[PDB]
Design a protein around this ligand. Structure first.
Ligand SMILES: *[C@@H]1O[C@H](CO[C@@H]2O[C@@H](C)[C@@H](O)[C@@H](O)[C@@H]2O)[C@@H](O[C@@H]2O[C@H](CO)[C@@H](O[C@@H]3O[C@H](CO[C@H]4O[C@H](CO)[C@@H](O)[C@H](O)[C@@H]4O)[C@@H](O)[C@H](O[C@H]4O[C@H](CO)[C@@H](O)[C@H](O)[C@@H]4O)[C@@H]3O)[C@H](O)[C@H]2NC(C)=O)[C@H](O)[C@H]1NC(C)=O
Lengths: 198, 120, 109
């Protein structure tokens, strides 16, 4: 087997999905090369879990998954096992015993708009918490107690999705970031992805 | 490595329609946006529009909205720009240019252009 | 509507001298600016991206500075191949809107 995996496709994609609609891709049956990813200095964050970043090329993976989306800069560390918060509880949660790597690089030149982005959405005021690795795209009006609503907005009846205000002049804290957190099965099944070797 | 080979110069009568091609190679054609910019003789660059090669969604400047249609052909990996109702002031060099996304960076390989002459 | 103003319109300088071109933004655009060059006949070639970083393969002579509203494009030492027009280029992301300045030509005395 010898192929070049589409890490370029996921990393060099023009448009990433919103956090609430975090895009997921499945990669298998390929020879990956994490050395290029690891050695690049562009990445602001490269924290890994369960697998040291150095020896990725020495592991054979059953099947790999790539989850890509955007985040409002400063709270990038919020995406991690155990760590709690708004988006982690409502949008994207990782399992406590998660195995994989988390990537993040400033993408102000790729996401922010001069007037205002107003095109990346994150959910607020979800009824209950969010289990690890589960999508949530429902756009039903949230009733904050009291009388219920029927397709109406008003007091205690806020919309569930809120848009970001990414702009070039926002400060590193409020600048867009792109996270392409990966996930390795390590199921000990017939390997499909493995690093370069003879 | 990236090449934006483009069609040669063309001459058309006023009011006709011109279909300018743009050949791209060395990268995934149906993955990155493509835009067009015309430079008129004695004037600065002016941006034409944008066309996603995958979805087919398009967008144009309001100054000439409705006078153009940029199609595509993913099989041969060539972009097309159709300009109808040509006029004398439309004589300009058109530069098809891809909008490549290097990691947190925009890389812009331009084509050699195409000089279109509107006259009788 | 974002409107850029590149000055001076034209200038001349002997080879090896330091040349500076200013480019003022009507509205704040952070650092969404690039500097492009146009040799006679050839297609535009982006020289500086991000208003600070030099495009891969370009000689180190060129440099870019400034931010917010005003930007500066500087050639440390002029050379014969530098004869060309130079354009500002502001870009927006989702609608890939490009806006260019009036340009400026370099002519060695
Ligand atoms: C996102 O895209 C980045 C840009 O890639 C270009 O654009 C895309 C659309 C494609 O068309 C692609 O083909 C283009 O190259 C991409 O960054 C690129 O990554 C590749 C590797 O995946 C780099 O190639 C390697 O370069 C190093 C060093 O290159 C230096 O010299 C060149 C000379 O032109 C300069 O241009 C560079 O800036 C560097 O200064 C080489 O040492 C290396 O050789 C080894 O690999 C080859 C096979 O590729 C073997 O045959 C050799 O024997 C060696 O083992 C490669 O040639 C490329 O330089 C790099 N471009 C830039 C501008 O950084 C990025 O990787 C993509 N995203 C992800 C997540 O990868």
């Amino acid at each position: 087997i010898t192929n070049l995996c589409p890490f370029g496709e996921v990393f060099n994609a023009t448009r990433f999905a919103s956090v609430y609609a975090w895009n997921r891709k499945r990669i298998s049956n390929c020879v990956a090369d994490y050395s290029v990813l690891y050695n690049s200095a562009s990445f602001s964050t490269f924290k890994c879990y369960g697998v040291s970043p150095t020896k990725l090329n020495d592991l054979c993976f059953t099947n790999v998954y790539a989850d890509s989306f955007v985040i409002r800069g400063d709270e990038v560390r919020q995406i991690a096992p155990g760590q709690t918060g708004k988006i982690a509880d409502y949008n994207y949660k990782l399992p406590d015993d998660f195995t994989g790597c988390v990537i993040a690089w400033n993408s102000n030149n790729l996401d922010s708009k001069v007037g205002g982005n107003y095109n990346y959405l994150y959910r607020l005021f979800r009824k209950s918490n969010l289990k690890p690795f589960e999508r949530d795209i429902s756009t039903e009006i949230y009733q904050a107690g009291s009388t219920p609503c029927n397709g109406v907005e008003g007091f205690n009846c806020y919309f569930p999705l809120q848009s970001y205000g990414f702009q070039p002049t926002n400060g590193v804290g409020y600048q867009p970031y792109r996270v392409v957190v990966l996930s390795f099965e390590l199921l000990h099944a017939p390997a499909t992805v493995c690093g370069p070797k003879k | 490595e990236v090449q934006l080979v483009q069609s040669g110069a063309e001459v058309k009568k006023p009011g006709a329609s011109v279909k300018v091609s743009c050949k791209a190679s060395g990268y995934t054609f149906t993955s990155y946006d493509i835009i067009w910019v015309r430079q008129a003789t004695g004037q600065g660059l002016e941006w034409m529009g944008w066309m996603d090669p995958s979805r087919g969604t398009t967008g144009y400047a309001q100054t000439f909205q409705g006078r153009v249609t940029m199609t595509r052909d993913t099989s041969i990996s060539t972009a097309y720009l159709e300009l109808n109702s040509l006029t004398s002031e439309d004589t300009a060099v058109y530069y098809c240019v891809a909008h490549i996304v290097v990691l947190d960076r925009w890389f812009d390989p331009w084509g050699q252009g195409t000089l279109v002459t509107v006259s009788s | 509507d974002i409107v850029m103003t590149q000055s001076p319109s034209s200038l001349s300088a002997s080879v090896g001298d330091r040349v500076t071109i200013t480019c003022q933004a009507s509205q704040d655009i952070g650092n969404f600016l690039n500097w492009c060059q146009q040799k006679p006949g050839q297609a535009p070639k982006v020289l500086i991206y991000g208003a600070s970083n030099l495009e891969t393969g370009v000689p180190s002579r060129f440099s870019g500075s400034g931010s917010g509203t005003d930007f500066t494009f500087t050639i440390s030492s002029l050379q014969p191949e530098d004869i060309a027009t130079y354009y500002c280029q502001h870009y927006d992301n989702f609608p890939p809107r490009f806006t260019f300045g009036q340009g400026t030509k370099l002519d060695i005395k």
